[PDB]
Amino acid sequence: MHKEVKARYDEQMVLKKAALLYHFQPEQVTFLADAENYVYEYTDEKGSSYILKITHTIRRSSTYILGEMDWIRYLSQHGISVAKPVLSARGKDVEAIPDQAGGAFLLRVYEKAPGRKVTEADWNGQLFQALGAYTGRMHQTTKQYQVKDPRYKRQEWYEEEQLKLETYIPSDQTVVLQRKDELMQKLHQLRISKDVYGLVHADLHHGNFHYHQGEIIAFDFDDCGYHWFINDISILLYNVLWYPVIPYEDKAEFTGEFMSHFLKGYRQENELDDAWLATIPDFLMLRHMLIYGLLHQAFDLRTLSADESAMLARFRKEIEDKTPITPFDFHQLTT
């Protein structure tokens, strides 16, 4: 959780106020997680249960959130299974509860996706191919998506707050900042067109979808933005390498297993030219840098535990040394 948001948030106060806008009893709310947003499951007066996501104007505007809502609705209209937004009692997509310190807590609600998180029995090539087909369909569909009013436009990849490392890491980390600057300049040389770049989810991982009768239902579109399609794919790879459901015996071999199955599914649904596969290591490194920023945004750097200092030191060393995120040779996937 963004440290500045944590400094503003009084859960009991906000849930008491939120209870009137969504018709729940605040003592009955179930806390789910507090990673980027504070997320709860609540039950309304009719006995129906929903997912409540709470954040703050420090990190999101209502307008920006409405751009996520627009896109999710478009995907659902075109047959992509996603968790849809639900309205407040006043018919609003996003409710704002004043923060007396300035700004607002921003609240919105979604339908609870059926099914469940993937388990060990699902963690295999069938899932990996299904992820490929689903991602490919999202990309194929997004090619036709138009924003009428630029006020609600989602960000370009390079605008991401957590990549602004110079604002979050101490400035004596000049090597890290050089690595990040060099990499973003490199990525900026890549061709952009409707066939290779568009609005994507940008945080695909197995905490962000349910498997329902063997089908994917995605949620947590909170980071969606304009990216290369290969980056959406690389982010998913980053995430399955980081927290696999079953530990892998070998990182390189697992990378190839995941990617081969994923690509079979993906290419049934959308074109991905072989030339993009060579860029995956660079996008994995960019994600590593983003996570480094996220961790600095979350941690009080004056009160770091031994474990937090060690984690930061590992990322730092990997970034400085240019240690590949995976040892897999991506040229093996080509032709």
Ligand SMILES: Nc1ncnc2c1ncn2[C@@H]1O[C@H](COP(=O)(O)OP(=O)(O)NP(=O)(O)O)[C@@H](O)[C@H]1O
């Ligand atoms: N629509 C939904 N249906 C069912 N469960 C959900 C839904 N949205 C969120 N959850 C659950 O709540 C958790 C947290 O919500 P999520 O939207 O992932 O929050 P976040 O703070 O953006 N997390 P992240 O960005 O992945 O670190 C998810 O991992 C799910 O377990």
Ligand SMILES: CC(C)C[C@H](NC(=O)[C@@H](O)[C@@H](O)[C@@H](N)CC(N)=O)[C@@H]1Cc2cccc(O)c2C(=O)O1
């Ligand atoms: C605390 C945080 C570091 C946790 C991390 N989440 C992410 O890396 C991403 O959600 C963020 O990097 C992303 N929200 C940042 C962004 N700007 O898009 C992790 C990533 C992850 C990978 C695989 C399975 C999972 O369930 C998860 C998960 O739930 O969260």
Ligand SMILES: [Mg+2]
């Ligand atoms: Mg999530």
Ligand SMILES: [Mg+2]
């Ligand atoms: Mg999220």
